[PDB]
Design a protein around this ligand. Structure first.
Ligand SMILES: [Zn+2]
Lengths: 48, 88, 298
DNA sequence: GAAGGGGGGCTATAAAAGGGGGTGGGGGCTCTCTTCCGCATCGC
DNA sequence: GCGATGCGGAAGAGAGTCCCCCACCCCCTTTTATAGCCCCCCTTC
């Protein structure tokens, strides 16, 4: 529980710590999506 | 109460009154100016024209004309060219 | 320029980007070129043009200033930067630039709107170029131009009010004012007592009813010729004093003189001329806190 | 000693005279590639 | 004894995402009429 294991389902709902830790995990995906758009775009241009 | 309407500023009437009271510098005779001019040279070897005018209390044009006849300008690169009260 | 339509006014279809004959619809010429900026104003601005040149600058030039050094190559052997900005502004432009700065400084002191400042800047440029006042100080010309601009805009300031915001005295402003009118071959409408009521009464913190009463009293007094030859400011100050003394908000002669720029003696003299016919001058629908009969007699 | 009063100066108008002074206008964030320096090595 | 030089490592660039002098003009001054305005001193109580 302390290190971010969510023992609840989405239907059950997340506890406040689980909700925050889940938000921390979700932020990583959002950062990657913003990073992935530009990181791969430069690779495509150089290959072409 | 700021910038209240006024016909003339107090600092300006005082300066105007002082200038009127003092009056314009008069053109004295050449002999008296020369005598006073050389007495000044005694205190200091070199004199600036702006400061020299105060000692003589004479018009700038009149002072330059008399100073030009005998005085000469020496060019100093450190600050600027000034006048020399030595005739030679 | 339709070949089959001598003297025909072509119509610009901006969306279609072409010039068309309004009669036959023929398209004449090439595509219309948008002369505006090719970029958009919404990271650094992708602008490749300089700031608009000042319209009020005789032979105004355009130039670029060297920025601050960044690396060691930008700095001389001993600290000071080797690439230093140089003063390349014309003497005429430099003086004109300083006058506009002085014009704005005075205007802010008495909270004049920017439109009056713009009118003043234009007035100074004409006088500065006309060169009839070349012997007078630029600040006096700017102060006189500021006075003329206020008159031209219908919101006159008194010579004393302009002198308060200017280092130049009232006498020198008045002298430059006459010369500027001669040089420009222009005139200013005569000032009336109602040209100062709003500012004088608002600065004295008088209600609208008292301001209206003062405006009526001065206008009626002038029409009745009870103050012949009196300065309009002196009449207005006396009218404000009369209206002020007839309402709850009562102001002393010293208070009204300070805002009006009129010595309390002058207010007393003008007031004494309109006091005899006080009931006639006051508006009919005026609520007298102090009855007109019991108004000050002095 | 506050306040009104009286007298006088200031303002503009022209004009002449002559000179001093005031005013304005010139001038003496990360990755990659290149360059320089110290060292140890041989050579003669 | 007497010089001479290539390579590794460090550094560093470089690209991508004011004070003075010299004309010119104004005011100094005098006279006078005009009148409103305003400073200053006097006087009142
Ligand atoms: Zn046509």
């Amino acid at each position: 529980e302390s290190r971010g294991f969510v023992e609840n389902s989405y239907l059950a709902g997340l506890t406040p710590t689980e909700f925050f830790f889940h938000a921390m995990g979700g932020r990583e995906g959002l950062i990657d999506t913003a990073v992935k758009t530009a990181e791969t775009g430069y690779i495509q241009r150089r290959l072409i | 109460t700021n910038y209240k309407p006024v016909a003339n500023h107090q600092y300006n009437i005082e300066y105007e009154r002082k200038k009127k009271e003092d009056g314009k510098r008069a053109r004295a005779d050449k002999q008296h100016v020369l005598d006073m001019l050389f007495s000044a040279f005694e205190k200091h070897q070199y004199y600036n024209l702006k400061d020299l005018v105060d000692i003589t209390k004479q018009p700038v044009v009149y002072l330059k004309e008399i100073l030009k006849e005998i005085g000469v300008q020496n060019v100093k690169g450190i600050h600027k060219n000034t006048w020399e009260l030595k005739p030679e | 320029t339709c070949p089959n339509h001598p003297d025909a006014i072509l119509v610009e279809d901006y969306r279609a980007g072409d010039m068309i004959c309004p009669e036959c619809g023929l398209v004449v010429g090439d595509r219309v070129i948008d002369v505006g900026s090719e970029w958009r104003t919404f990271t650094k601005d992708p602008s490749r043009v300089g700031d608009s040149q000042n319209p009020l600058l005789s032979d105004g030039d355009l130039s670029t200033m060297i920025g601050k050094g960044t690396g060691a190559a930008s700095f001389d052997e001993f600290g000071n930067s080797k690439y230093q900005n140089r003063r390349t502004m014309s003497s005429s432009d430099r003086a004109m630039m300083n006058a506009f700065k002085e014009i704005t400084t005075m205007a802010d002191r008495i909270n004049l709107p920017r439109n009056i400042v713009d009118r003043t800047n234009n007035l100074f440029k004409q006088v500065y170029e006309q060169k009839s006042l070349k012997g007078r100080a630029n600040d006096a010309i700017a102060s006189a131009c500021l006075y003329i601009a206020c008159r031209q805009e219908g919101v006159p300031r008194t010579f004393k009010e302009i002198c308060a915001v200017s280092r130049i005295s009232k006498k020198e402003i008045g002298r430059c004012f006459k010369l500027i009118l001669k040089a420009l071959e222009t005139s200013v409408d005569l000032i009336t007592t109602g040209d100062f009521m709003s500012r004088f009464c608002s600065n004295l913190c008088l209600p609208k009813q008292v301001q209206m009463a003062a405006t009526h009293i001065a206008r009626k007094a002038v029409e009745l010729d009870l103050v012949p030859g009196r300065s309009p400011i002196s009449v207005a100050a006396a009218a404000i004093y009369m209206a002020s003394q007839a309402s709850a908000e009562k102001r002393t002669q010293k208070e009204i003189g300070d805002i009006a720029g009129v010595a309390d003696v002058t207010i007393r003299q003008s007031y004494r001329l309109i006091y005899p016919r006080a009931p006639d001058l006051f508006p009919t629908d005026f609520k007298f806190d102090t009855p007109v009969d019991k108004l000050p007699q002095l």
